[model samples]
Target: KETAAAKFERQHMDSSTSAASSSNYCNQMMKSRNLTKDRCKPVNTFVHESLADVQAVCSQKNVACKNGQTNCYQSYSTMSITDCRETGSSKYGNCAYKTTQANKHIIVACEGNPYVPVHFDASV
Candidate 1:
């Protein structure tokens, strides 16, 4: 079974590269990662950092989640990330995305005994 922590990695982790130069990165990655198989994900984000570094965010100071939960934490250091947003012309079968890269402090929600990132809450 895919745990929440693993699911977060599958959806957000992209440590292979710190920057995306290709315009088709979002189009290719969204499809290859199965995010466009069923319905287009309106928005998604990819963090270009190691799992260890992201997991460490759990130990940082707690912050409020989008839903007001206090389980989210903001990273102490800025990280490279890419934001993928669906274009107006995007559809289910042909999900088009616009990619924007940035260096920002990431916020994520954590869970479990060995606390790990389970959700990407936001970035600052």
Candidate 2:
């Protein structure tokens, strides 16, 4: 029911303050992704947060169109980019994440095309 930007802002602001959790979510989110021009992952873009919602918006099928150097985009809080994709790389897998023993960062990634803002987040 919430717009993409609203959801992102809510989560982001919640994390920014001490309320989302004492877990330092904002610190975790910014540690990795380049959120400037990033869009939330498509809801149908395979496994990830809000995949259903994304698919609905993008009008995609649940099944993967193809494999290997696949292309797409990721967004959060209305932040969006285009033509990025999943490498399906054995190393990165279908998606990417950011982790610190200090528990202070989140990084979302897509593998092809012009990479834009890498927005941080709290989910997979």
Candidate 3:
């Protein structure tokens, strides 16, 4: 089974991609990272920052999750991130997305013994 730390890295880490063209980045990454296996993930955000910074967010301000859970957290400052949103034309087996990059304070859901981020909740 994939550990929470490992899964977070695979799904959200993209430190070296400081600048990506508005091309097929999300299409490639979403598939390459195994997020598009059974079905497409409607939306996701890849943080272009250090893993330590992201992990540190677990200790940042707490917030109510979108689903009303109490385990969510929000970053204290803006960080580089690329938003991947599935396009309306996207089909099941052939997912397509629009890539938009920005520096934003992100919200995520945390879990586990060490209490680290497990899901990208949103960006504000």
Candidate 4:
């Protein structure tokens, strides 16, 4: 049984690898992480920071999520991240992606007893 925090880590966290070495980073990671199991994930972001650092964001500034939830919080400092956007030619099983790396503040929705990030909302 995967909790929301576990799912979030699987789908978004990549602290071990701090950088995307090649253009195929997303193509490999998306599939490896099972995000491409059923269909291509149109857009996703990978945060290259420790789980503790990300979890700490739950105590940062509160903000409204895209779906109107107030559980979201924005990181106070810019962090390393890689954004994966599906290519126009992407298909269900043959998903393709474009990787873009950047340093920015991330917004994530937090929940649960320990109050950790469960949903990645956006980056700014």
Top-scoring candidate (lDDT): 4
Candidate 2, 36-82: lDDT as tens digits: 22543322111122433333322221122224222323323332221
Tell me the deviation in Å of residue 112 in model 3.
2.1
Compare candidates 1 and 4 on TM-score and give the better one: 1
Model 4 lDDT tens row, 38-70: 778899899999989999999998999999988
Query: Which candidate number has the best TM-score?
Result: 1
Model 2: which ten-residue window has the lowest total lDDT?
Answer: 40-49
Better of 1 and 4 by lDDT: 4
For 6-114, candidate 1 gives per-residue lDDT tens digits of 8998999999987888888899888878898779989999999888898999999799999998899999999999999998898878788998989999999999988
Model 2: per-residue Cα lDDT at residue 11: 33
TM-score of every model?
0.96, 0.20, 0.88, 0.96
Give residue 89's error in model 3 in angstroms: 2.0
Lowest lDDT 10-residue stretch of candidate 3: 15-24
Give the alpha carbon lDDT tens digit for every residue of 1-124 in model 3: 9897678789899888775566788888899999889999999889988888998999999889999899998999999888899998998898999988788999989898887888888899
Task: State in Å the error of residue 27, model 4.
Answer: 0.4
* lDDT ranking, high to low: 4, 1, 3, 2
Per-residue lDDT of 52 in model 2 = 38
Better of 1 and 2 by lDDT: 1
